Design a protein around this motif. Structure first.
Motif, mmCIF file in Angstrom:
data_model
loop_
_atom_site.group_PDB
_atom_site.id
_atom_site.type_symbol
_atom_site.label_atom_id
_atom_site.label_comp_id
_atom_site.label_asym_id
_atom_site.label_seq_id
_atom_site.Cartn_x
_atom_site.Cartn_y
_atom_site.Cartn_z
ATOM 1 N N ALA A 74 0.866 -1.195 0.000
ATOM 2 C CA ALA A 74 0.000 0.000 0.000
ATOM 3 C C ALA A 74 0.893 1.232 0.000
ATOM 4 O O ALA A 74 1.876 1.274 0.757
ATOM 5 N N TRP A 102 -2.376 5.410 -6.329
ATOM 6 C CA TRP A 102 -2.099 4.535 -5.179
ATOM 7 C C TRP A 102 -2.261 3.071 -5.508
ATOM 8 O O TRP A 102 -2.894 2.686 -6.483
ATOM 9 N N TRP A 104 -3.656 -0.257 -3.296
ATOM 10 C CA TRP A 104 -4.447 -0.630 -2.101
ATOM 11 C C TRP A 104 -5.126 -1.958 -2.388
ATOM 12 O O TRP A 104 -5.840 -2.045 -3.421
ATOM 13 N N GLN A 105 -4.892 -2.974 -1.550
ATOM 14 C CA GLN A 105 -5.610 -4.273 -1.701
ATOM 15 C C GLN A 105 -5.507 -4.778 -3.121
ATOM 16 O O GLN A 105 -6.558 -5.222 -3.730
ATOM 17 N N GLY A 169 1.884 4.328 3.714
ATOM 18 C CA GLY A 169 0.799 3.403 4.094
ATOM 19 C C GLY A 169 0.991 2.833 5.487
ATOM 20 O O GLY A 169 2.083 2.874 6.055
#
Ligand SMILES: Nc1ccc(S(=O)(=O)Nc2ccccn2)cc1
Length: 185
Positions: A74, A102, A104-105, A169
């Motif tokens: 992240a 970004w 993310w996941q 992150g």
């Protein structure tokens, strides 16, 4: 892209960092610490998130730099207005003064409002960031995939000086401890 020749030497501004970040002596690397880093609070520090700004301020010209994201789960990268909100909760959006992408996941997204899905076939280990102040452009490049374009923000309304923007992150998972590093020219 042939943007490499507008390369700028970016360094991180300790005074803007969230109090859990550890910035290297050379001001070219940042990572999440496992605790508060024993610094005083100030009105510049991002309070809610693991964010830090570059020291450089840009109000004209073309600028390019590269960031190493190897093994992170992240992160957020891009530019922001010098006057962005530092305290409390906020969204990364151009309305709030941010031009960012970004991870993310396991998905990559551009920080539009609402966010935009990115299509990256080769997960990047290094990201190039290009700003043309006069044109109102912020572009992102996949250095791992021969410099392929990731995303272009155009018709940007910067509305002030810009600063390099970083988010290392959180590390709830124990899999996101790795630093962001500014890559050499
Ligand atoms: N509003 C808000 C919420 C969470 C965060 S984050 O620091 O977790 N980083 C990210 C980055 C991309 C997506 C979610 N959180 C930042 C801003």
């Amino acid at each position: 892209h042939h943007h490499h020749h507008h390369m700028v030497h970016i360094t991180l501004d300790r005074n803007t960092a969230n109090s859990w970040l550890i910035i290297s002596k050379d001001r070219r690397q940042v990572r999440m610490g496992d605790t508060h880093q024993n610094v005083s609070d100030n009105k510049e520090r991002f309070s809610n998130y693991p964010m830090v700004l570059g020291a450089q301020r840009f109000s004209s010209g073309k600028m390019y730099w590269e960031v190493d994201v190897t093994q992170k789960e992240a992160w957020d990268l891009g530019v922001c207005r010098d006057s962005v909100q530092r305290k409390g909760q906020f969204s990364l959006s151009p309305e709030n003064g941010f031009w960012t992408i970004w991870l993310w996941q396991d998905s990559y997204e551009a920080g539009t409002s609402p966010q935009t899905t990115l299509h990256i076939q080769v997960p990047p280990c290094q990201i190039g960031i290009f700003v043309d102040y006069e044109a109102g452009v912020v572009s992102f490049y996949n250095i791992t995939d021969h410099g392929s374009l990731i995303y272009t923000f155009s018709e940007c309304v910067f509305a002030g000086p810009l600063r390099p923007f970083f988010n290392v992150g959180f590390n709830y998972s124990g899999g996101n401890a790795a630093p962001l590093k500014l890559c050499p020219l």
